[PDB]
Amino acid sequence: DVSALGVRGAEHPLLLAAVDVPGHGGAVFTGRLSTDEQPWLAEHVVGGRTLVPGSVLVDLALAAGEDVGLPVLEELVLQRPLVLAGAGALLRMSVGAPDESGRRTIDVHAAEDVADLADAQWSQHATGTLAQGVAAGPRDTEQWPPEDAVRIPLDDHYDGLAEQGYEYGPSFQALRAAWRKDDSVYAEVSIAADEEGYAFHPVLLDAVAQTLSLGALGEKLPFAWNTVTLHASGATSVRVVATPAGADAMALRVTDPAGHLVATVDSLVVR
Amino acid sequence: DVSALGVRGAEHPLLLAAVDVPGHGGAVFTGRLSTDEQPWLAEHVVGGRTLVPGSVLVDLALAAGEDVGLPVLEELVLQRPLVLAGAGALLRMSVGAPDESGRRTIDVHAAEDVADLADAQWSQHATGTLAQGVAAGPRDTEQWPPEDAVRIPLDDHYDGLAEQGYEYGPSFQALRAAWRKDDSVYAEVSIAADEEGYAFHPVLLDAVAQTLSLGALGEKLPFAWNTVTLHASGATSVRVVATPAGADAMALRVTDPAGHLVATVDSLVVR
Ligand SMILES: [Cl-]
Ligand SMILES: [Cl-]
């Protein structure tokens, strides 16, 4: 039925079809987001607007990279957040030709949902670069959290944020425990398993980025993700170490509860 | 159902879906050819092989240009003819980003038919450039054929060609009358109406190119089409004036029987 239209079907929960560009090895991906299909979308509200979390675009870009064979998100810069309008949103990712180094540009567009794709009013929401896979470090066997780390009490964490206009519903309240040492933050982050097929579940990935609120940073929204590497897919329960990385940024190291490396982010920048 | 997969449906008889690349204004088109659906494919046999006529790729490229908004085929260079293998063939056309002049590259690939598009063994069959539309000349009101033109008898034209290994079945025997003056050739060319939705019906367009066999050229296969402009779609009956255009090439001017301009080709080159 997908082959009947001459496209490939996409396994990612948010994607519908993929089409290769045979001459340059790129590809175009189409998908659709809506609160009906992904009710957790309704639980990320910022200043009164239902905003799609940037982590949705990061996970989709990782899925695109894995499909095209360039699985590292060397950079993704988020423009305007997607504002979810009851009607849902169409998504379109384009991966272009390789540069001399073998890297490719990826662009991400969205539009208000329409019946006929010719009518889609695309706007650009992100752009970045896909690159080659890198090896995983060794399993972490050190005490968790580290010896001198002290508990960060989380009791009114989400209440506090809500006051400030950042309203995370239970689906996004995924910081389960946290500790601090110097300006490093250690956290256990987990969601309930649901859809398979994400590269890194975007609710889980947003909650990984939430660790930045617990450090010297916490008093914006992430806007640039730099060197995102994925070593395991399908995680719903991870440990995160967030370390300072220059102004308005932290590096992230994400493992499973057994210490195996799951993902790294050289710097996540807020603005 | 097409919108369900996030693509646009294609009106061209050989195409299945189209997908825009919103960032650069290009697009990717997929389709499929087979003798079951287009029985005339079986009637173009060259040296014993069932070869898809180059005019199929030219018509598809014009359809792509019209869709993207660049309706002139500034050039199309045909590589290896597509050899039709009982299983049919998949087709894929990619239109890229505009150059500074606003022109775009178009690539055409084909593969043996497969159930899963991920398995498609694409090979490149043509590449060219799409450009901006140009105005039509005035209606031709001159005597047809011109006053001093003499009949070219056509009686064993197709028999002769068949001897030489070029076997055109009745569907392609579309040269209905021809005349010559100097090295110019005038011809009436027509097929029976069938599928709508072609930019220039590829059987009709191959028979337009057949006029090159009637002139000082006629004793190969066209391999480069230079500046193909379309002023009318849906023609099944045309008049053709073919004029010498340098070595191994002729220019073509194609009108309806009322003299209105339908198409021009600055040079069609054989090799
Ligand atoms: Cl494909
Ligand atoms: Cl589209």
| Resolution in angstrom units | 1.9
Would you call B12 a catalytic residue per the annotation?
no
Q: In this structure, are residues B45 and B51 in contact, taking their beta carbons and an 8 Å threshold?
A: yes
Per-domain residue ranges for chain A? 1-271
Residues of B in contact with A124 (CB under 8 A): 22-23
Catalytically annotated residue among B109, B125, B157, B206: B206
Cα B174 to Cα A153, B56, B225, B234: the distances in Å are 85, 16, 20, 16
Say how far apart CA A45 and CA A53 lie, in whole Å.
9
Nearest to A17 among B5, B31, B116 (CB): B5
Please pick, among B12, B44, B109, B125, the residue that the annotation labels catalytic: B44
Rounded Cα distance between B268 and B227, Å, is 9
Both tokens assigned to B136: 């039509």
* Distance of residue B48 Cα from the nearest chain A Cα, in angstroms: 29
Domain A1-271: CATH class, spelled out: alpha beta
Rounded-to-integer distance, Cα A144 and Cα A186, Å? 9
DSSP category for residue B83: B
Q: CB B2 to CB A117 under 8 A?
A: yes
Question: Is the minimum CB–CB distance between A94 and chain B shorter than 8 Å?
Answer: yes
Angle at alpha carbon of residue A145, lines to A143 and A147, rounded to 5°: 65
φ and ψ at A246, to 5 degrees?
A: 95, -175
Ligand nearest to the CA of B7: 2
**B86 DSSP assignment:** T
Closest by CA position to A249, among listed A214, A219, A212: A212
Q: Do B19 and A21 touch (CB under 8 A)?
A: no
Q: Which two three-digit tokens encode residue B6?
A: 């996030």
Distance CA A177, CA A173 (A): 11
In a 10 Å sphere around its CB, with 0-12 CB exposed, 13-18 middle and 19+ buried, how is residue B101 labelled? exposed
Residue with tokens 């990712």: A93
Distance separating alpha carbons of residues A58 and A76, to the nearest angstrom: 7
SS3 per residue for chain A: CCHHHCCEECCCCCEEEEEECCCCCCEEEEEEECCCCCHHHHHEEECCEEECCHHHHHHHHHHHHHHHCCCEEEEEEECCCCECCCCCEEEEEEEEEECCCCCEEEEEEEEECCCCHHHCCCEEEEEEEEECCCCCCCCCCCCCCCCCCEECCCCCHHHHHHHCCEEECHHHCCEEEEEEECCEEEEEEECCCCCCCCCCCHHHHHHHHHHHHHCCCCCCCEEEEEEEEECCCCCCEEEEEEEECCCCEEEEEEECCCCCEEEEEEEEEEC
Q: Are A111 and A89 in contact (CB under 8 A)?
A: yes
Q: Judge contact between A191 and A236, C-beta under 8 A.
A: yes
Q: Each residue of A238-267: b (16+ CB within 10 Å) or e?
A: bbbbbebbeebbbbbbbbbeeeebbbbbeb
Three-state secondary-structure class, residue B32: strand
| Side-chain-facing half-sphere of B128: CA atoms under 13 Å | 31
SS3 B196: coil
A6:B118 CB<8 A: no
User: Other C-beta atoms within 10 Å of B155: how many?
Assistant: 7
> Rounded CA gap, A199 and A76, in Å?
15
Method: X-ray
Whole-number Å distance between alpha carbons of B43 and B224? 22
Partners of B12 on chain A (C-beta within 8 Å) are none
Write the DSSP symbol of residue B170. G
B110 CA: distance to closest CA in chain A (Å): 9
Where do we find the tokens 């039925």? A1
Query: Chain A residues with CB inside 8 Å of B31's CB?
Result: 6
| B17 and A CB contact within 8 Å | yes
Active-site annotation holds for B119? no
Q: Spell out which residues of chain A touch residue B37, defining contact as CB-CB under 8 Å.
A: none
Q: What is each CA distance from B21 to A29, B63, B142, in whole angstroms?
A: 10, 17, 46
Q: Does residue B270 sit at the A interface (CB-CB below 8 Å)?
A: no
* CA distance to B135, B218, B242, B243, per residue, from B253 (Å): 14, 18, 7, 8
Tokens of B59: 């018509």
> Around B222, how many Cα atoms within 13 Å sit in the side-chain half-sphere?
31
Phi, psi of B40 (to 5 degrees): -60, -20
